Amino acid sequence: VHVPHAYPEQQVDLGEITMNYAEAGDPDRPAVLLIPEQTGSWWSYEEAMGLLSEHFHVYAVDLRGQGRSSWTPKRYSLDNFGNDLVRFIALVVKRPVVVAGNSSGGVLAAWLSAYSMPGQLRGVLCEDPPFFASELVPAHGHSVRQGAGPVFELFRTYLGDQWSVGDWEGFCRAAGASASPMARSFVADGIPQHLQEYDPEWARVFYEGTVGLSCPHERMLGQVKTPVLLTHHMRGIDPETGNLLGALSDEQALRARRLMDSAGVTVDYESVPDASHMMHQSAPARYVEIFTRWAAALA
Amino acid sequence: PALRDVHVPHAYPEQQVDLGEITMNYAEAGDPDRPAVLLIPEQTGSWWSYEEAMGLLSEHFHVYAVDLRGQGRSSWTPKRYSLDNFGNDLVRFIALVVKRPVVVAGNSSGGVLAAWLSAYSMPGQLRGVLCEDPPFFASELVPAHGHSVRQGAGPVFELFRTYLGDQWSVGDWEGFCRAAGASASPMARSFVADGIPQHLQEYDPEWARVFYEGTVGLSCPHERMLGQVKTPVLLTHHMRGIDPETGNLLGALSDEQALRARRLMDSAGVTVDYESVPDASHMMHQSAPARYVEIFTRWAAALA
Amino acid sequence: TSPALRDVHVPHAYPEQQVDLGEITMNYAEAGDPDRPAVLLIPEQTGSWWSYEEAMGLLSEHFHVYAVDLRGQGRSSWTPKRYSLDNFGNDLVRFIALVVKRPVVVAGNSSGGVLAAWLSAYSMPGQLRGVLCEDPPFFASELVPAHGHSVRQGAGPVFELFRTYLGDQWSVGDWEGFCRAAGASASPMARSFVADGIPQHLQEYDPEWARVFYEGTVGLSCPHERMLGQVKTPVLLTHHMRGIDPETGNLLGALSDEQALRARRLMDSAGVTVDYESVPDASHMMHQSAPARYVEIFTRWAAAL
Amino acid sequence: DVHVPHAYPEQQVDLGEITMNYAEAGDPDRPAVLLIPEQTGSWWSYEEAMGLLSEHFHVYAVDLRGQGRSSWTPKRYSLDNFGNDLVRFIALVVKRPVVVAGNSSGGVLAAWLSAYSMPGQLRGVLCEDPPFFASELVPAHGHSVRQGAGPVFELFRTYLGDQWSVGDWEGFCRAAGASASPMARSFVADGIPQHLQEYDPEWARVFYEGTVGLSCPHERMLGQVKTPVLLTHHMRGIDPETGNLLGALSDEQALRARRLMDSAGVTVDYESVPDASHMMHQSAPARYVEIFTRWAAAL
């Protein structure tokens, strides 16, 4: 299923799983780790990796259940993703890292900041993170069922765990009829390449609230141990449904920022209301600029 | 309280009816020829929660006020507390005792059960329902609109579950008061008292468990309940607000949740009458009985 | 003509009618002289009222027989998000109060046999003379039973296949995918359902049924321990084929010998008369595979009542 | 607040989210061994055995999170989190291949490490009377936890409570003496045992509610082991009055565990000691140490 890409691909044995990834930049430059969004593979960062390879040693990784990394039925949880990335940092990077993650990847960047092995990290970028919005029963704001829940429901029903169903036509019919604008956005004639590399059990665990069941966001956010850059992209409310448009509300962002303040770290909050969910794709230069500014200030 | 030897006297005499699984305790007032009314109390509330309002309404109505299962002298039923079990209990009560079409008034939890009846009773049993400060969507763990119970009254339910326990099996009122006095929830700070209130002595705290854990209405989502109401609905909306410190709701339901609930009930095609009294306490039938009875009597007069 | 469209019902030997119970419409068939003792037949899961067709005939010569489609089945209402033991049971309570209007002898198969017991414990007073539980999955249909194997070691495999490949209200409807998955399954029951076309009874079936059993929500507020321990009418429990799949250890049949033992002990503690008829040579749906045997068993029992 | 003197000095190490307390015996000349206690069991559960083992092994006995002097972590008690804790401990303290040995819940974590640790971390594992499948809420084979140890877990959750928030030992004893579960009755005592004073009862909650193993089904674990295994099966039977399990796991559950582990391609040794207590390393130290040493020398 796997198509050619700009950078050569490598695979590492993290124990339970094998992780696919891709390197860029001069080795001696500072290390950067790029975590894709859900339904996103490492080559989600390609453009940005280019821009970033000028100054950093860039690693971009396929999480488990994505890309060419291992698919693990019944094993998708926040802690398993996070310890995957911890083992990657220790076995492959072998140096302190600045982590950047988009959406679910941003959630795992915060997870690393709070729960990585000591001194594994210098700072994390959380790019449009669904703090509390990706939870089934958050401590603040809307649940996943009022956010991206609908999209996940469609993935679970019509694609199935490990593409066991694979009813793409049914998926497009129901998605086009969804009141969720994001749901109606995922419609296409053929299956996008990124979804072909995606295990839809990801959707199941987010929709059903099991992925973070033992990793509540308030404790994560209250236990961060590194500087955090939080970018906050398009956001809004669908008047017809009340549902959250975007990754997280202003209220949820404020609560997350104040929890991270209680953890005693320094937070750079950059509201970019006009940016798309995946700014590293829609506007690679703007994203690399923000990241580089914040990164220079560390250590 | 766990021995259930706490019954005390009241203004009206008390009757009991076998409904099948449970026995329901209840009180009755007014001329039996008058239009029938069914009063459903709030959680932790017994029938006598309506005593005062029964004394006014009785002058114009045949009033029945009930103890739901797990409250008062009605049966306590471990592992059996769901919205459908409460509702079908009330259906059987209407069929076996009232034997007339009723107008139903419910407060908080009862108001939700009132809407339940409006949607799910046997045909013809109801002429209309009053939902008094109902936690529409705010009592669900995963509501379709707005904020979950965990961001509302879930803190107090958690205290009840941990420190009082199913059927008062723990009964650590000292630990409960200690934790309640230190809660960010003001509603929890309300319950702190030197002695256990009579209404809490008659209350089975497994109630609190099933609401806090999301099991009580798991098979009865509020979106569909409200989208299938079948009688005129009178929804009163009392004090609501936001604790600036927590972002957790104060009061029964948020403005957004009231809005979406009204939209659902209108899609059901019923006449919805929204009466907003932001200065009113949660149990207006107890704190301002005259005002409550006036509102109810005016709306009920227009029913038929 | 699609199971999702609910336009697949076919003619049958007995007249059908629908009653408004308030949330749902319940479809039902009637047979026999309306003055003879009343009887209520509850089908099995994926079973419609005409699951009893043949038995109805034999029984209608001595009983006024009602046979019902439960919600989520046949021509009764399909109610998304509303499928639970208590809702099924209260539908049947309503049906007895509104249609039969006389005390009834209830007989239910499998899931229906679990609802017969439900009624015996939780119905309105005086509604029932006795109940016949035909191969009921006591404890084996629960996700976390007090005794014996869970539904995941019983019928769960086939329920998972229904949920995944048919979907709520036939929203997925991938019959060929279901057949491929079922034929490769290690559950013999699951393999049984493979067929060239979709069987008629399954066309009338809301597979959300399967979901609520597979996920353990259908009986969450109705633990079988409490139900069985609060029966208030005489109960006849028939126990058909049962065994253990050696490759898996999973239950073959409706319930295990141990689970039937514990259920009988519970019911005996309730103070009711309990009859136990172990018929190890009988299929799960004895009322279909051996109608005359079934009617003999039922007739003796009901005449004692 | 309650820790008392023991036969060995205690050490602590920061694993990144938690602080793990532990004790050490024997010499670095000798091969590394990692002892994992049972639930409610602290490191000193192994004290006597440690002595014997220190004759020929460098021994590490650990406090798991929520036990002893290790960090208490509310809402974070999952098998994956315990397991990644022990992976971190092996990586940061032992820094050597280790022969792991765990008892009861500890045996389950030993299996977890065999299947899911970082590559090359382990040489083999001894699962001592492990509750394979019988500690799960919905096991793929045999009794569930609710027909096993679940009754005592429910008593712990209702009367001791999260982080000893309730602490009603009188009520615990009243309920335990009236328990139909004989193990529940075995926990009745005048005062609170020292091992239970260092124990966080949220442990009991997450086993009773089935959250701890939700994302770690035992069938996948056992089918993906990667080291030689030694499984010891102690006392087991059935309570006639309830049908409930006596012991860690049934004969059927042991049979299925072994079939899975053998399907994984490892060397599985099965040692049935039907007359042994649950904590044989405590009740018969020399017997336990003989069995362990006899097996570990083959590695």
Author numbering:
A (entry chain D): 10 to 308
B (entry chain B): 5 to 308
C (entry chain A): 3 to 307
D (entry chain C): 9 to 307
Please quote the authors directly.
ZenA cleaves zearalenone [ZEN, (S,E)-14,16-dihydroxy-3-methyl-3,4,5,6,9,10-hexahydro-1H-benzo[c]oxacyclotetradecine-1,7(8H)-dione] to hydrolyzed zearalenone [HZEN, (S,E)-2,4-dihydroxy-6-(10-hydroxy-6-oxoundec-1-en-1-yl)benzoic acid], which decarboxylates spontaneously to decarboxylated hydrolyzed zearalenone [DHZEN, (S,E)-1-(3,5-dihydroxyphenyl)-10-hydroxyundec-1-en-6-one]. The X-ray crystal structures not only revealed canonical features of α/β hydrolases with a cap domain including a Ser-His-Asp catalytic triad but also unusual features including an uncommon oxyanion hole motif and a peripheral, short antiparallel β-sheet involved in tetramer interactions.
Two inter subunit interactions are responsible for tetramer formation.
